[PDB]
């Protein structure tokens, strides 16, 4: 290279950013976008902990992306975990804000 030096000690660098990261509502899939341009297919996870087990699914970009789907059960603060190589990432757990409200209710009428 051409008077290079550009080999820093920690340039791999991976970051969550989206909609469902900032918040979202009960009985709806967050969807966000995490960085994961430069990292490069390596050991990268993803894990969800908070008032309720919510689903998370993975696309493929095939590009230089990672397009992420949870669904939670209930309203409430998010901790969305993405490690890297054993490895936290600068912004993980992404403390996601979900809100939403249940209540009981009647059916039949006249029994």
């Given at each position: 290279?051409?008077?290079?030096?550009?080999?820093?000690?920690?340039?791999?660098?991976?970051?969550?950013?989206?909609?469902?990261l900032?918040?979202?509502?009960?009985?709806?899939?967050?969807?966000?976008?995490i960085?994961?341009?430069?990292?490069?297919?390596?050991?990268?996870?993803?894990?969800?902990?908070?008032?309720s087990?919510?689903?998370?699914?993975?696309?493929?970009?095939?590009?230089?992306?990672?397009?992420?789907?949870?669904?939670p059960?209930?309203?409430?603060?998010?901790?969305?975990?993405?490690?890297?190589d054993?490895?936290?990432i600068?912004?993980?757990?992404?403390?996601?804000?979900?809100?939403?409200?249940d209540?009981?209710r009647?059916?039949?009428?006249?029994?």
């Amino acid at each position: 290279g051409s008077s290079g030096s550009s080999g820093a000690i920690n340039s791999r660098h991976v970051s969550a950013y989206g909609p469902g990261l900032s918040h979202g509502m009960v009985n709806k899939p967050a969807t966000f976008t995490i960085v994961t341009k430069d990292a490069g297919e390596g050991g990268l996870s993803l894990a969800v902990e908070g008032p309720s087990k919510a689903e998370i699914t993975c696309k493929d970009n095939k590009d230089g992306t990672c397009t992420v789907s949870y669904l939670p059960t209930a309203p409430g603060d998010y901790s969305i975990i993405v490690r890297f190589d054993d490895k936290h990432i600068p912004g993980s757990p992404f403390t996601a804000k979900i809100t939403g409200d249940d209540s009981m209710r009647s059916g039949p009428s006249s029994g």
